[PDB]
Design a protein around this ligand. Structure first.
Ligand SMILES: Nc1ncnc2c1ncn2[C@@H]1O[C@H](COP(=O)(O)OP(=O)(O)O)[C@@H](O)[C@H]1O
Ligand SMILES: [Ca+2]
Ligand SMILES: [Ca+2]
Ligand SMILES: [Ca+2]
Ligand SMILES: [Mg+2]
Lengths: 160, 375, 126, 57, 74, 57
């Protein structure tokens, strides 16, 4: 969703207008005003490829932000921009160890919230408290107050 | 993890290695003495390239790894397994280096000189250890027993040692070792179970039946009478449930397995049973102290965890010796770890801290001179 | 907040991470230079005689052997450490595997071909 | 949802069965030890009675 | 017995790098430049050693890190 | 089918829990009797040793 929404916001206005037009084309005559498994499969047939039902479910689950089981415009942009794989080309294991070490400056084996916050402060961008909390949750899985190396590895999916 | 500069007590007993820091009452790292070796060659990618498993890592996988015993009858067969088990105990469980604290090892009585020189050399040259010391198991067991008189019977896995100590006096001339123990009992149970009908010829099953013996097998109070009453079995035969699920049914064989100790003729050896050998050892001692040896006999070794050994010993000794005196046999609780426990209480004395052997004197003297210094 | 902001923060983290790594590399180079200057000091050949140069060369050879001995000990330590690191890393991989095998969905059809096939001539910016 | 519930119930049953087997092995060992102690105590009792009689004699 | 030979090989590996030096066929001036090449060898050696040291430190952190992982997924 | 499997797993878990609890009560009872018998045997052995000392004297 991270790279997806980033690419979405990177779209231009004319592109988003074409996306809205294509959405109206896909939901043309629909009954829920959104693209569900039925409408997505209909579009896939209209194209040529055939999609597995479980695959259609898993895809709609990888684009929704609401919880409707259907694809709306806000999710149409994600479903129409996810093509480029932004989170590919994972950094080398040595580079990952370097990342963990420099995030664990005091040499302890854990990236406490203080290190993450000072890092966000150092980056220079205006860090919002909500951003801090969301990143802290994304890293620290068990919510013990620190990001270990396994939780840090988990922090690298959707990141590049 | 450790804030006290004290020797690491590592009892490398045959069948079970028991390692722990001095001052503790029980070993923390207890694992069998086995080395599992990758049998086949895999084209798979990603698995550990480690070419030598050890301890619980080998116990968890006994179907793929061919199992080799690092000790046989007492004589060390392979030294690579020795280096493996110490390096593992040092850098996988204890999480401490030997370069910061001494190490009080325990060796079996009447062992080869090559074994002692080899272990000492691996502990001085290869590993940087400030000081080493070899100790006999019987003395430490008598320490843990809390006495100074008696004959210690240490039955390990492949060797059995009878060591008489009266009024705190070792008798190096009377110590007689006999290679009858848990492995020959496992072999006897295996061949008699093959006679029963369930035939196996692999080591993993051998370890499984060894565990089954440790759990169920006991000593009989009257062999022939139990044979007669078990001919028509009812409660005498038990149905055990294998950890895999196969329903095994074992009857009299249990209390006939350790009986091989009392009748070595079953394995076609002219050696005498453990009780008769101990009795002969008592005659080899002087008469004056024989009564005290009768009244203070102590037992050691994991093999003594079977129920019914004390009573069998009492009846056999009473049948062999006169029945006029008093012959009480004492077995301290948790005798198996007692040896190790002794090590702990032996490493806390300052005098013992003065009886260690540092690197420099050993290097100039050489290993053989070190053998003379100890004894 | 949005997810794009989090991605921007993460990429900024990565670049500030790389700059930090470069700074640490430069500091390590400087520390190596200083340690070299402290340990191995230059020679003083001005005023040495024939036999004196011979004795100096013998002493330099002895120092050569002493340093190689130290380096060999440190290299044996480094090899033991490499072995231990490999063992521990593989054990951790075996532990953490379980059910965490990922993939990038293949039904995500490339936008360029999809955009052409849906629009025709209208697709110019995408 | 039902598969998660099944997995949790299965793990619970496995843990319970393991603990139960450990308790059973302990029970057998303790029962054999108690039987041995009762037999030996009876022998000591009869022996002490015999020795009291011998003291009187 | 092979382990004793292993320790002997450790000393033998230190022994192999050292070779006999000859100061009889050299003159006064050449010896000086030759002393300098010995000196550079020294320099070189310590450099690699230093590297190892730094790597050792790094490697130790790795170990620590690794330990934490087994203490978080057990 | 998975619901049937969940029901079976729950039944087995209940059975194992009940058996483990019964075994825990039995273990407590047997340990109580065990320590009582150990005390009795120690007393008997002490009295026998006293009688032996008297016999020798
Ligand atoms: N809990 C146990 N119950 C029965 N037998 C055991 C037990 N533990 C070990 N043994 C037996 O003891 C032998 C190993 O004894 P060992 O560990 O050498 O004793 P020690 O450490 O006192 O020298 C093996 O043959 C094994 O079958
Ligand atoms: Ca939706
Ligand atoms: Ca930290
Ligand atoms: Ca955490
Ligand atoms: Mg023993």
């Amino acid at each position: 969703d991270d790279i997806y929404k980033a690419a979405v916001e990177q779209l231009t206005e004319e592109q988003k207008n074409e996306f809205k037009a294509a959405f109206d084309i896909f939901v043309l005559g629909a009954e829920d005003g959104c693209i569900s498994t039925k409408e997505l499969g209909k579009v896939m047939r209209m194209l040529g490829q055939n999609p597995t039902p479980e695959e259609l479910q898993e895809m709609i689950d990888e684009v929704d932000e609401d919880g409707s089981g259907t694809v709306d415009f806000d999710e149409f942009l994600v479903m129409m921009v996810r093509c480029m794989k932004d989170d590919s080309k994972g950094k080398s294991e040595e580079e990952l160890s370097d990342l963990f070490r420099m995030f664990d400056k005091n040499a302890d084996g854990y990236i406490d919230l203080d290190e993450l916050k000072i890092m966000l402060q150092a980056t220079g961008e205006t860090i919002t408290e909500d951003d801090i909390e969301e990143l802290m949750k994304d890293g620290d899985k068990n919510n013990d107050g620190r990001i270990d190396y396994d939780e840090f590895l988990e922090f690298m999916k959707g990141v590049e | 993890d450790e804030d006290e500069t004290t020797a690491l007590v590592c009892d490398n007993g045959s069948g079970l290695v028991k390692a722990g820091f001095a001052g503790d009452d029980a070993p923390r790292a207890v694992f069998p003495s086995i080395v599992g070796r990758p049998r086949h060659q895999g084209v798979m990618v990603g698995m550990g390239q480690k070419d030598s498993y050890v301890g619980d890592e080998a116990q968890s996988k006994r179907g793929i790894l061919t199992l080799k015993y690092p000790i046989e009858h007492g004589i060390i067969t392979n030294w690579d397994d020795m280096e493996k088990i110490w390096h593992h105990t040092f850098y996988n469980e204890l999480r401490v280096a030997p370069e910061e604290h001494p190490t009080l090892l325990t060796e079996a009585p009447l062992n080869p000189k090559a074994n002692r020189e080899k272990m000492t050399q691996i502990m001085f040259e290869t590993f940087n250890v400030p000081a080493m010391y070899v100790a006999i198991q019987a003395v430490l067991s008598l320490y843990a027993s809390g006495r100074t008189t008696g004959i210690v019977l240490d039955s390990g896995d492949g060797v059995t040692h009878n060591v008489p100590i009266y009024e705190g006096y070792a008798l190096p001339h009377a110590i007689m070792r006999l290679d009858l123990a848990g492995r020959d009992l496992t072999d006897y149970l295996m061949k008699i179970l093959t006679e029963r009908g369930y035939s196996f010829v692999t080591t993993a099953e051998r370890e499984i039946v060894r565990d089954i013996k440790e759990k169920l097998c006991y000593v009989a109070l009257d062999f022939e009478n139990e044979m007669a009453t078990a001919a028509s079995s009812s409660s005498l035969e038990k149905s055990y449930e294998l950890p895999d699920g196969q329903v095994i049914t074992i009857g009299n064989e249990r209390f006939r397995c350790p009986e091989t100790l009392f009748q070595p003729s079953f394995i076609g050896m002219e050696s005498a049973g453990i009780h008769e050998t101990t009795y002969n050892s008592i005659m080899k001692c002087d008469i004056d102290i024989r009564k005290d040896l009768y009244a203070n006999n102590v037992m050691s070794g994991g093999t003594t965890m079977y129920p019914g050994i004390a009573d069998r010993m009492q009846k056999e000794i009473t049948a062999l010796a006169p029945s006029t005196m008093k012959i009480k046999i004492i077995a301290p609780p948790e005798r198996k770890y007692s040896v190790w426990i002794g090590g702990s209480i032996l490493a806390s004395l300052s005098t013992f801290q003065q009886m260690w052997i540092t690197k420099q004197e050993y290097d100039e003297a050489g290993p053989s001179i070190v053998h003379r210094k100890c004894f | 907040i949005s997810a794009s902001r989090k991605l921007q923060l993460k990429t900024l983290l990565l670049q500030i991470a790389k700059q930090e790594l470069e700074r640490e590399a430069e500091e390590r180079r400087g520390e190596k230079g200083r340690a070299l200057s402290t340990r191995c000091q230059p020679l003083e050949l001005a005023g040495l005689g024939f036999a004196e140069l011979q004795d100096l060369c013998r002493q330099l050879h002895a120092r050569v052997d002493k340093v190689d001995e130290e380096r060999y000990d440190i290299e044996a330590k480094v090899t033991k450490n490499i072995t231990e690191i490999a063992d521990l890393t593989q054990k951790i991989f075996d532990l953490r595997g379980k059910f965490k095998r990922p993939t990038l969905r293949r039904v995500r059809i490339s936008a360029d071909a999809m955009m052409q096939a849906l629009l025709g001539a209208r697709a110019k910016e995408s | 949802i039902i598969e998660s519930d099944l997995e949790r119930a299965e793990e619970r049953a496995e843990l319970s069965e393991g603990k139960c087997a450990e308790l059973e092995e302990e029970l057998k060992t303790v029962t054999n030890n108690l039987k041995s102690l009762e037999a030996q105590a009876e022998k000591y009792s009869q022996k002490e009675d015999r020795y009291e009689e011998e003291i009187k004699v | 017995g092979k382990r004793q030979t292993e320790r002997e090989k450790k000393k033998k590996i230190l022994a192999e790098r050292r070779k006999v030096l000859a100061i009889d066929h050299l003159n006064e001036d050449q010896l000086r430049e030759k002393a300098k090449e010995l000196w550079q060898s020294i320099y070189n050696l310590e450099a690699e050693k230093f590297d190892l040291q730094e790597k050792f430190k790094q490697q130790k952190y790795e170990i620590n890190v690794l330990r934490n992982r087994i203490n978080d997924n057990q």
